[PDB]
Paper text:
[name] is a complex multidomain enzyme having two separate active centers that catalyze a three-step reaction involving two highly unstable intraenzymatic intermediates and intermediate migration between both active centers. Bicarbonate is phosphorylated by one ATP molecule (ATPA) to give carboxyphosphate, which is then attacked by ammonia, yielding carbamate, which is phosphorylated by another ATP molecule (ATPB) to produce carbamoyl phosphate. The [name] monomer presents the previously inferred 6-globular domain architecture, with 2-domain and 4-domain respective N- and C-terminal moieties that correspond, respectively, to the small and large subunits of bacterial CPSs (these are heterodimeric, intrinsically active and NAG-independent CPSs), with an extensive interface of ~2400 Å2 between these moieties.
The crystals of the apo and the ligand-bound forms of human recombinant CPS127 (lacking the N-terminal [name] targeting peptide, residues 1–37; replaced by a His-tag to facilitate purification) contained in their asymmetric units, one or two similar dimers, respectively. Although exhibiting the same overall architecture (averaged r.m.s.d., 1.3 Å for the superposition of 1285 Cα atoms), the apo and ligand-bound forms present large differences that arise from structural rearrangements in domain L4 and in both phosphorylation domains L1 and L3. The structures of the L3 domain are highly similar in the apo and ligand-bound forms (r.m.s.d., 0.83 Å for 340 residues). In contrast, in the case of the L1 domain there are ~90 residues that are disordered (and thus that are not seen) in the apo form and that become ordered when the enzyme has the ligands bound to it. These structural findings parallel the observations that ATPB binds to domain L3 irrespective of whether NAG is or is not bound2042, whereas the affinity of the enzyme for ATPA, the ATP molecule that binds in domain L1, is extremely low in the absence of NAG20. Indeed, the crystal structures account for this decreased affinity, since in the apo form, the entire B subdomain of domain L1, and loop L1β11-L1β12 (residues 654–662; called here the K-loop) could not be traced, indicating that they are mobile or disordered. Interestingly, the L1β17-L1β18 loop (residues 777–793; named here the T-loop because of its equivalence in the L1 domain to the T'-loop of the L3 domain) could not be traced in the apo form. All the residues of the L3 domain mediating these interactions belong to the L3β15-L3β16 loop (residues 1311–1333), named here the T′-loop (from signal transmission loop), which transitions from a β-hairpin in the apo form to a 20 Å-wide expanded loop in the ligand-bound form. In the ligand-bound form, Thr1443 interacts with NAG, while in the apo form it interacts with Leu1325 from the L3 domain.
Author numbering:
A (entry chain B): 1171 to 1481, 1484 to 1495
B (entry chain A): 509 to 561, 624 to 655, 660 to 778, 793 to 1130, 1139 to 1153, 1163 to 1481, 1484 to 1496
Write the structure that this text describes.
Amino acid sequence: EGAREVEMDAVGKDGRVISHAISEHVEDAGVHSGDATLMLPTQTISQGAIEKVKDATRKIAKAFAISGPFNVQFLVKGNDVLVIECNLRASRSFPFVSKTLGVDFIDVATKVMIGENVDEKHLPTLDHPIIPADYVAIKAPMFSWPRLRDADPILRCEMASTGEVACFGEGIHTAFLKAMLSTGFKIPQKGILIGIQQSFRPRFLGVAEQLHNEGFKLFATEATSDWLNANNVPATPVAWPSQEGQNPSLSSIRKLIRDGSIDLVINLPNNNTKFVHDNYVIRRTAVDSGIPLLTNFQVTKLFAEAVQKSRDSKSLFHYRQYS
Amino acid sequence: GGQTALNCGVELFKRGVLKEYGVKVLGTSVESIMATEDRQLFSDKLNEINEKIKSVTGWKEIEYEVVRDADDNCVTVCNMENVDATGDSVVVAPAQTLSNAEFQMLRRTSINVVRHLGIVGECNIQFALHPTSMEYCIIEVNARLSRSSALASKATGYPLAFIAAKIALGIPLPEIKNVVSGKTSACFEPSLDYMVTKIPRWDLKSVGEVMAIGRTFEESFQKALRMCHPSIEGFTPRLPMNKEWPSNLDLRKELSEPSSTRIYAIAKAIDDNMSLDEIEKLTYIDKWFLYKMRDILNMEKTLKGLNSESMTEETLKRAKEIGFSDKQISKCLGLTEAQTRELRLKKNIHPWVKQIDTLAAEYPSVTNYLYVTYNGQEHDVNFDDHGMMVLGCGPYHIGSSVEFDWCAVSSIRTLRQLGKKTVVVNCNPETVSTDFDECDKLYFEELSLERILDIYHQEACGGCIISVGGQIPNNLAVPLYKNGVKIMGTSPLQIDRAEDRSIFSAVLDELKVAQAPWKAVNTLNEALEFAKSVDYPCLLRPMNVVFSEDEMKKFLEPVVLTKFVEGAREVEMDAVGKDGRVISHAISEHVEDAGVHSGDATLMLPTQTISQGAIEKVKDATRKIAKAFAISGPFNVQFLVKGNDVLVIECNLRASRSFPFVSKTLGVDFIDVATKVMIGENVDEKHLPTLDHPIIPADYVAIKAPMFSWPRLRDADPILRCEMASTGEVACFGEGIHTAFLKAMLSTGFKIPQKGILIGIQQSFRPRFLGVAEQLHNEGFKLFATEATSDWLNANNVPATPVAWPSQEGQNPSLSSIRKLIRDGSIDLVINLPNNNTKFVHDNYVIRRTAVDSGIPLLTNFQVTKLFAEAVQKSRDSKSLFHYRQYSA
């Protein structure tokens, strides 16, 4: 629990690593690794863990006599580094890593595999990595939508996603906001629907206060709204979609999303089978109305940090040269 | 090993562990020790030989250091008299105001007490003697090495600890050699032909001490005062740090209360013509000392009436002989220090180098343990070595502790291993580096420009290292350089540039290295103008925080303002440069967010939560800085990091307190490398942690934390706030930072909490804290808090037990008291985070004080608290953490 996930993308030649790039997932390890948002270079990984990641990669490449591209995924908690798995082929992050580092990893790999000599002097080998200093890169899905496990094995609601947006920023926060804009969203500035599991309240109150201090009006289902208000974070109560008929007093989510009062939905994973349907409906509504939907806590924190640091929008892309 | 080691040994004896494993306690037996540690047993034992133990204030306090061997030979090695009125006094050795009859009566009792208790080794005994009769009593006996025993060795040249260890093997005193004379044995009592003065160093309750040697009381005493702080001129009616006396001053009140400024108050009382009898009555200081103090002030008056043409050789000679510096004299005559030195040397008035030989020259010594005095007519040594001078750190205080002792030792050793002669200068009697067996000449002397020039030019040293003794030696770089001293390594001109803020900051601009916006202000309005343009809060250097405009108003009773970003990390770069190239470096991360003082920050090495891009920027800025100041030697740069933003905070062009930590963690002595670079000795860079090939431990992390922290109340009344101060060092390795942290907690002598936690936080901090509170509770800690905070926790479904504010105990019988719960063991950890509410600053100080007095861990920072909560989650028992792990590379 609470582990970070790290991707190693590399090219081997005769069992030696002659190009590599280490990326960190924004999301804690566990929620599917294939729709994870990647940051390059790493942001919150200890230097010792990075050394272990490099060392394990060195050994793996030699044990399987690698000549060509490969990928290894790792769990990192503090200094503990655990291999999750290895794919002895190019991964979906090869293009991202290549454009970020200014070196085409597939070109290098293709050369190695056909026996065309390659000059390692300027490549990101394990001994001399390429680490962007002046910018960070983020890779996020283009589109995400919810899926209901209506098949009936378990009752749960998952996210699926597809496509790719990748952007550069001076730091990960501006890269993130650029990726949000690139996916076609407006950066929220009005109101936020907050959905969280009750057991997650202690861990969330900090971020809730922070969003409210940035000037967002907060909305939540009644018990959560009462909880926020009792902790002196102002919040407006709304109804569960399935209970719109049981209280005329409370406003409906659909209506508030339509009038533009809510322009961001945070809807974190929730195991309570009582509200899985409603949570699916809430997520579906956000997506249908074209407003950003955050379903992970680390992503949510990243967003809250990013709006704090930021302002307009044209300024983020302002004809910066990245290399 | 001090009190903790004694208690640990005694405890093992009592449990039968020493008996079970056949381990003999060497030296004084545990039975005897216990008799000296318990007041009742002590009283009982003394009554068997007609000695006894009420108020003894105003009595003279005298102590003796006694050595007794296994064959019952027993000598007194040193005696000391407290000047003022436990171990925070001005002390002189030998005692000055006793008759033979008094001295020998106490000596005799010392020896009888020491025999009756069965001391085999060293012993300290303290007496109170009635000031106008022969009545006395014994205050206490210490049967372990102490501050006093250390002071006695340094004062006499008699190596107590070494001799005590030999005695513990059953070797008698006549069979052990006196290492200073070589020709005689440990079986003798030193005769001193000089006087020693020890003065505590207070935080400007004591944090360090100085010792000075002179051949008049006045020479010794003025020297020792100067050694305390560079703003102290000697014995004068003016305060340290250039502060002026309040207009509402109650002088009699200031005299009757012991405090850190009492000595200056005495000087004022005399100067304002209060009689010495009255001063004696109020201070209990024996009038003999006050006559010497009056003589110093009369000389200041005599000097003020003179000038550079009218002052005679005789008068100047006398002034120097009673401890006047060229600086003091310059102010009286209307000259500069440098003109005064020139005038004095034109009359050929100079000091003389003498040996501390333990025997008052009864026998020739070849000792290289030296001091410098105007009271003489010849030098005791030759000046043919032309050695390399190494300057020590001066007294310990906050931000300047044992780490610089390590750096001195390494530097001195490197020189010796290269066959270079060394001259060491220091005045701190608590240091290991002031060991006359490890250097060729040791001067136990002032670290002032005047006295360093005296020694350097008399020895005709080949060079001087100023880089390994902290701030004191480094601030003398330019003055030394202008007076003919060859400084090794980075040029003094570059040191001056790097530590001039304006020039440093312009150099960073040109290099395109970012820094925290800052300004030097004069008017109060210039401060508001700056604060406006970058928002509150702001920092202040003469380091204090400023939350509002009102708060700024109070502080001016030249000042620099800086904005630190909120929520930033802080990072230290420790490095060695050679010809402007970084050939060794190490980057450490502070646990604490930037802002709370950087000198008691806990360090982690290598970094834990710093982005890779920030690390690259840190390296690049260090590369440029080293080239811009042409660095050859050690240096340090501090940075703020927020995400990818990296801002230089400052640069110190010398070794930092983290050089030992970094050296041991990386397996490379950074001081050895630096010392080699500075003297031109070639070094192989192949295996060093250069910028291009760092050394980054993979299998372990290192942590460096303070040994001891205690709270301080701003009762001075500028602001009402409670801060932490700390001293010492513990460093440990662990598989990760969490286990390193727990090992550091155990190494500092704490038990890892497992029962209950007191939670104190500012109300506005609740949203940010609730997560960690839940996490601690989920680990099985019972939570306690003051009522409103307890209610808040409970309403958020985190169980908590309410307790009372200390100031409100007995106003509610329902609520339990913190003190009681700490005593029963229900609370074994206190979290007390900074709190601005002036209503509860006093209670928060009391809570913090209670935790410290009861010996339970106290966390006062949120990041540290998070680190602890994470660490207990991961951990189990205790022996397992240190389980014979091998740490390297």
